[PDB]
Structures are given as C-alpha cells and as structure tokens.
Design a binder for this molecule. Structure first.
Ligand code: HEM
Length: 146
C-alpha cells in the first residue's frame, strides 16, 4: 500500500526529472552540507551556484529515474537494487546514513512540488526505509558497516 501511496504523487517528479532532480540535490547540499564532499565532481561549488547547475540537475535526474524504477517495482527489485548498493558502497563509498538524509529531502521536495500530504510522507518514509534496509543488507554482505 505504501508504494501505491507514493506512486499516486510521483507524476510531477517523473514529469521533470531534471528540474526535480536539481531541487533534490540542491536541497540536500544546503540542508546537509557535509554530503556535498561525497560528490567530488560537485564538492566545493558554492551553494548559490548549485540550483542553476545543469550537471547537478542531470545527476539528480539519474537518481530520481533510478528511484522511480525501484518504486514502480513495488518491493521486488533485486536486479535494480543490488547494483545500486554495490556501486554506492564500493565505488562512491557512501556510508548508509546518507540515504536517510536524501530520503528526507525527497519527502520535503515532494510535499512542496508533488502534493505529497502528511499520509503520503509517512508512506514515502516507509518505502525509503524498505529500500535503505535492503541497501544496508547488501552493504554488509560487501564488508561495509560505517
Ligand atoms: C536512493 C537514493 C539514491 C539513488 C537512487 C542513487 C542513484 C545513483 C545512480 C543511478 C548513480 C549512477 C550509477 C552508479 O554509479 O551507481 C549514482 C551515482 C552516485 N551517487 Fe547516488 N544515489 C542515491 C543516493 C546517493 C547518496 C545519498 C549519495 C551521497 C550522499 C550518492 C552519491 C553518489 C555519487 C558520488 C555518485 C557518482 C557520481 C559521479 O561520479 O558521476 N548517491 N547514484
């Protein structure tokens, strides 16, 4: 049910993955500034320059596309999620808590741009909890617990 609740508000996200993707990464770097250094291509860019940055928005679109794939899969997602865990743990070297930060940013952005009301916000936190628990199990398989 919680996947359905998120998907009934995903339209504005999927309608402009670049714009919304930019909103999400811009807000992530503002509200959680320590996350920006985890993106060496973006680290060091002054906050005022991030909202208008096409590379940041293009990356945000990649992120939200991938999340849309997971959401549309409704909890049967191993072929999508395992590679995502593998690359984030081992290539990007992103400790798991950072996913919790981006999820909360997404909740905020969807409340403002996608009509995601209080119940939908609960649902999205639950769904992101499912995804993050699966990422974290995979991280642990690979030796990553930090
Ligand atoms: C569920 C949330 C997220 C999704 C769906 C997601 C998805 C992606 C995808 C699809 C890519 C490109 C393919 C790949 O390298 O795996 C990527 C790259 C990356 N992600 Fe994420 N990501 C998420 C969260 C995060 C977080 C929270 C961080 C750090 C705070 C992060 C840091 C990176 C970095 C550093 C890259 C490589 C960028 C580059 O070198 O071009 N990701 N992510």
């Amino acid at each position: 049910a919680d996947f359905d609740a998120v998907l009934k508000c995903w339209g504005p996200v999927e309608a402009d993955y670049t714009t919304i993707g930019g909103l999400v990464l811009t807000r992530l770097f503002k509200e959680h500034p320590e996350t920006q250094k985890l993106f060496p291509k973006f680290a060091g860019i002054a906050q005022a320059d991030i909202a208008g940055n096409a590379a940041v928005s293009a990356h945000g679109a990649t992120v939200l596309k991938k999340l849309g794939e997971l959401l549309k899969a409704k909890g049967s997602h191993a072929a999508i999620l395992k590679p995502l865990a593998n690359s984030h743990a081992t290539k990007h070297k992103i400790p798991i808590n950072n996913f919790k930060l981006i999820s909360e940013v997404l909740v905020k952005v969807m409340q403002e741009k996608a009509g995601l009301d209080a119940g939908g916000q609960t649902a999205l936190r639950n769904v992101m909890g499912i995804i993050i628990a699966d990422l974290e199990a995979n991280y642990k398989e690979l030796g990553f617990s930090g």
